[PDB]
Design a binder for this molecule. Structure first.
Ligand SMILES: CC(C)(COP(=O)(O)OP(=O)(O)OC[C@H]1O[C@@H](n2cnc3c(N)ncnc32)[C@H](O)[C@@H]1OP(=O)(O)O)[C@@H](O)C(=O)NCCC(=O)NCCS
Ligand SMILES: CC(C)(COP(=O)(O)OP(=O)(O)OC[C@H]1O[C@@H](n2cnc3c(N)ncnc32)[C@H](O)[C@@H]1OP(=O)(O)O)[C@@H](O)C(=O)NCCC(=O)NCCS
Ligand SMILES: [Cl-]
Ligand SMILES: [Cl-]
Ligand SMILES: [Cl-]
Ligand SMILES: [Cl-]
Ligand SMILES: [Cl-]
Lengths: 125, 118, 125
């Protein structure tokens, strides 16, 4: 059964503007350790960040809570499987919420165009 | 089982142009009574309308009038669907037990996805 | 059970620009024979192609593979049923892979505005 659904659209130029304002501080804030390692050596760091931000926002919506009760963007880790498909890995409070809700499967998709990154997340029992 | 899936993208500027041309007529046509009440006191009514239009369009596609697809938000802010009239009747016929709604926006666009489920 | 999820966003102007520089080449590669016939006489052919790209990219992502192992965008044929709702018809490797994955239901939606087309695909047991 579907336990939740979330979507996000991110203006890549906005992420770019935040980076101009505060350097790597947005990345330090929203990225897990594994994602941070990827960001550091990524070919297009702004685009990577915009995409990960989109998944994290969609995930928070999919859990039906948004960011609250000790949740945080850095607890929603994006990784890719061997074929390139995006996946979610949960940490701390996010992981505890998933276990409480009885989450068995987390479906993630990412898309981008020149100006926008979009993501949709479905969580399932 | 998934009974239906719908998505929508709405250019907020397009909605603004409709409102410039015909006032609050669009809002009168597509909003339910509860949504209308929110529209009247909203700090950003056009954006509220664009987002609700997005959900309604997505809901219509998921089922395969817009004011019969009411958007409300729960205690945590999560968007939800409430059905009226012919929409409610259709849902019972199809055996819809669960309806999942999400919406998002940025400066120029609002987006929504709706999944209906047995 | 959800077997996969895919989404895509297409800037219509980008498709317009590719057509301006290389004509029919983009369309011939990604469209099935049925879609090609429609493209050749469609009243809004660029918009048609952009929407087809959106669905096809979302479908390739929903299968969890992207374009690899003999899969091709021209194998994910979009058609509209007697009611008018968008549907997927699969060919070649895509058809074979769906069977092997145990796909019993495919859910397709698409949307467009003046500048952008988008689509989401869910495959299900
Ligand atoms: C939802 C969230 C994760 C995204 O941040 P954000 O973009 O600032 O969220 P906003 O407060 O602007 O709300 C945008 C939309 O997200 C959706 N949303 C809000 N809270 C939500 C929740 N707890 N679960 C799922 N969706 C939610 C709503 O539909 C909202 O639009 P609406 O209030 O017009 O219905 C936020 O709770 C955090 O922070
Ligand atoms: C799926 C595909 C059609 C999408 O291509 P695209 O939209 O032009 O852009 P990209 O290839 O950069 O992929 C964009 C996102 O699609 C998603 N994606 C990639 N491979 C995927 C797969 N096998 N299944 C589902 N989603 C996938 C990823 O989230 C990716 O972003 P990320 O790498 O930052 O996580 C393409 O990646 C593909 O065909 N992959 C197969 C292998 C290949 O050609 N290389
Ligand atoms: Cl800015
Ligand atoms: Cl009402
Ligand atoms: Cl056109
Ligand atoms: Cl169509
Ligand atoms: Cl355009």
């Amino acid at each position: 059964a579907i336990l939740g659904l979330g979507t996000a659209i991110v203006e890549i130029a906005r992420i770019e503007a935040v980076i101009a304002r505060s350097g790597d501080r947005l990345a330090r804030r929203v990225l897990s350790d594994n994602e941070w390692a990827i960001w550091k050596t990524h070919h297009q760091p702004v685009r990577f960040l915009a995409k990960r931000f989109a998944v994290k926002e969609a995930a928070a919506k999919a859990f039906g809570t948004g960011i609250r009760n000790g949740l945080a963007f850095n607890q929603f880790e994006v990784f890719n499987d061997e074929l390139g498909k995006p996946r979610l890995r949960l940490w701390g409070e996010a992981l505890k919420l998933a276990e409480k809700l009885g989450v068995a499967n987390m479906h993630v998709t990412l898309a981008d165009e020149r100006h926008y990154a979009c993501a949709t997340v479905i969580i399932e029992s």
